[PDB]
């Protein structure tokens, strides 16, 4: 147990934003998802609360993690582990003190864990344009996201892989509904609407004297959980620069093979996916300007100002990439 001590030391920052997931990925023999999921369940005492057999949890996590493609640069088990950990941190934000039930917390975390499982490394648009079997199956509607959900739920049926075995029938139904609602919201084509509803909610925001939010009905809470996992899924630009840059390299490394795939097919090369005409820096600045910042700014509003540091980091990272943009 040499470096196993270093691993355990790294996992001590599970509640901190910039957790170094990449190191944990190595120190765990490529099991960041299993490791992090397990430690978060311990941390949240979910194992006890829902009577989840530890052996069952690990058996499931192992299978789930196995279904994340190793030959995929970005959408893999490290990404999954990252979104899980980020959702974990966001759930603990002060403004959301005791707002969510244990079942809702469980759903959000489980949803994060499976949100991209079995991702092939190509976009929904690619799958649609190449007339993939997956697109045929899902009628070009949230092709990947639907698939992720199917796979994640399917794996629960195997050998004591069913970590939810001891939840009441009603609880199992709720969890399935919430998980489906959250993961389907990670589809980027739903970003605008999601953000719109979030803004509508930031106004008409009901807060208790202390500072905690007041979410009465389900549709209000599920909306927050959706945007939360969405923020977690799009949190790379808000993490410490060293991490962010690694992610950017991975996502570009994945976009290019798709562009290559498209060049072979004779297809119109998707934007950013063109190896010979990419502006990595500009793309990041744009990605932040059009998607990430608008979203996080709104989130920062809702949980004001618990997200103030994250927002600041985002804006700093934008300037860094901005400066890196070639001037010629």
Ligand X SMILES: COc1cc(-c2ccc(=O)[nH]n2)ccc1OC(F)F
The residues assigned a catalytic role are 75
The Cα angle at residue 75 between residues 20 and 278, in degrees rounded to 5: 95
| 3-state DSSP assignment of residue 74 | coil
Given Mg ion, ligand X, its own copies, none, residue 176, with its beta carbon under 5 to 8 Å by kind, binds: its own copies
Tell the smallest beta-carbon distance from residue 172 to ligand X (Å): 24
Site mask for ligand X (CB under 6 A), range 266-295, x = bound: -----------------xx--x--------
* Cβ-contact 220, 201 below 8 angstroms: yes
Given its own copies, Mg ion, ligand X, none, residue 125, with its beta carbon under 5 to 8 Å by kind, binds: its own copies
C-beta of 42 vs 270, nearer to its own copies: 270
Pick from 142, 175, 138: nearest CA to 156 = 175
Q: Which residues contact 79 (CB under 8 A, 6 or more apart)?
A: 68, 116
- Distance in angstroms (rounded) separating the CA atoms of residues 324 and 281: 6
Beta bridge partners of 213: 207
- Distance in angstroms (rounded) separating the CA atoms of residues 149 and 118: 10
Tokens 């430690």 belong to residue: 39
Segment 161-190, which members bind Mg ion (CB under 5 A)? Answer: 186
Q: Is 78 in the site for ligand X (CB under 6 A)?
A: no
Residue ranges of the annotated binding site are 75, 79, 115-116, 233, 236, 284, 287
Q: What length is written for the chain?
A: 328
Given Zn ion, ligand X, its own copies, none, residue 177, with its beta carbon under 5 to 8 Å by kind, binds: its own copies
Q: Which of 247, 256, 296, 299 binds ligand X (CB under 6 A)?
A: 247
Give the residues lining the site for ligand X (CB under 6 A): 188, 209, 236-237, 247-248, 251, 283-284, 287
């Amino acid at each position: 147990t040499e470096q196993e001590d270093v691993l355990a030391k790294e996992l001590e920052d599970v509640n901190k934003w910039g957790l170094h997931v990449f190191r944990i990925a190595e120190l765990s023999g490529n099991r960041p998802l299993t490791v992090i999921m397990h430690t978060i369940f311990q941390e949240r005492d979910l194992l006890k609360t829902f009577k989840i057999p530890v052996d069952t949890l690990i058996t499931y996590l192992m299978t789930l993690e196995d279904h994340y493609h190793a030959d995929v640069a970005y959408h893999n088990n490290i990404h999954a582990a990252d979104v899980v950990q980020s959702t974990h941190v966001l759930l603990s934000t002060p403004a959301l003190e005791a707002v969510f039930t244990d079942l809702e917390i469980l759903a959000a975390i489980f949803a994060s864990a499976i949100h991209d499982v079995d991702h092939p490394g190509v976009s929904n648009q690619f799958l649609i344009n190449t007339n993939s079997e997956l697109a045929l199956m899902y009628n070009d509607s949230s092709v990947l996201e639907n698939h992720h959900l199917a796979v994640g739920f399917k794996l629960l049926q195997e050998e004591n892989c069913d970590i939810f075995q001891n939840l009441t029938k009603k609880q199992r139904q709720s969890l399935r509904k919430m998980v489906i609602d959250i993961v389907l919201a990670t589809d980027m084509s739903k970003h605008m609407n999601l953000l719109a509803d979030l803004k509508t909610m930031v106004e008409t925001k009901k807060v208790t004297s202390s500072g905690v939010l007041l979410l009465d009905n389900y549709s209000d809470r599920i909306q927050v959980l959706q945007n939360m996992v969405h923020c977690a899924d799009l949190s790379n630009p808000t993490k410490p620069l060293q991490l962010y840059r690694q992610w950017t390299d991975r996502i570009m490394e994945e976009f290019f093979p798709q562009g290559d795939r498209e060049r072979e097919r004779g297809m119109e090369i998707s934007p950013m996916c063109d190896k010979h005409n990419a502006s990595v820096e500009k793309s990041q600045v744009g990605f932040i300007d059009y998607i990430v910042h608008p979203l996080w700014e709104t989130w920062a509003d809702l949980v004001h100002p618990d997200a103030q540091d994250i927002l600041d980091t985002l804006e700093d990272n934008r300037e860094w990439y901005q400066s890196t943009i070639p001037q010629s």
